[PDB]
């Protein structure tokens, strides 16, 4: 039974690579983080920074979340991210993803003690 903080780590952290280097990155990573068990998760972003740097965003720029809550924070600097999005031809259990690498600010929602990211809201 996964904690919110651990679910964020599993779904969104990939510190082992600096960037997505191939078109199949999302296919491989969505499968290995168990995001295609029982259904194809339609959209998911991976962050290629250290966990410490992502946790530090909870002390950066406080902004509104898309849902209206006020516990979201925007990173001061851009970060290396990979957006993974199901293609139109994807259908469970043969999930298929488009891989888009970018450098953008991240917006996360933070909660708890310690105060850590629990939701990925957007990137800018
Ligand atoms: Cl898992
Ligand atoms: Cl996401
Ligand atoms: Cl401010
Ligand atoms: Na938690």
Domain boundaries of the chain, sorted by first residue:
1-124
66 is an annotated ligand-binding site residue: yes
Residues 108, 76: contact at Cβ < 8 Å? Answer: no
Give phi and psi for 52, each to the nearest 5: -55, -40
Residues 6+ apart with CB under 8 A from 111: 4, 71, 118
Resolution in angstroms, to 1 decimal, for this deposition? 1.6
Q: What residues are labeled active site?
A: 12, 119
Query: Comparing C-alpha atoms, which of 29, 7, 43 is closest to residue 118?
Result: 7
Torsion of the alpha carbons at 21, 99, 77 and 113, rounded to the nearest 10: -110
110 Cα: distance to centroid of ligand 4 (angstroms)? 9
7 Cα: distance to centroid of ligand 4 (angstroms)? 8
Please, which experimental method was used?
X-ray
Round to whole Å and give the CA distance between 66 and 37: 27
113 Cα: distance to centroid of ligand 2 (angstroms)? 23
91 is an annotated ligand-binding site residue: no
Round to whole Å and give the CA distance between 36 and 93: 8
């Amino acid at each position: 039974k996964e904690t919110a903080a651990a679910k964020f780590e599993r779904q969104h952290m990939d510190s082992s690579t600096s960037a997505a280097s191939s078109s199949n990155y999302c296919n491989q990573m969505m499968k290995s983080r168990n995001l295609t068990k029982d259904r194809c998760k339609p959209v998911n972003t991976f962050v290629h920074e250290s966990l410490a740097d992502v946790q530090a965003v909870c002390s950066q720029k406080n902004v509104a979340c898309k849902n209206g809550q006020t516990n979201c924070y925007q990173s001061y600097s851009t970060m290396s991210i990979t957006d993974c999005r199901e293609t139109g031809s994807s259908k469970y259990p043969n999930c298929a993803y488009k891989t888009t690498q970018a450098n953008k600010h991240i917006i996360v929602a933070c909660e708890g003690n310690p105060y850590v990211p629990v939701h990925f809201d957007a990137s800018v």
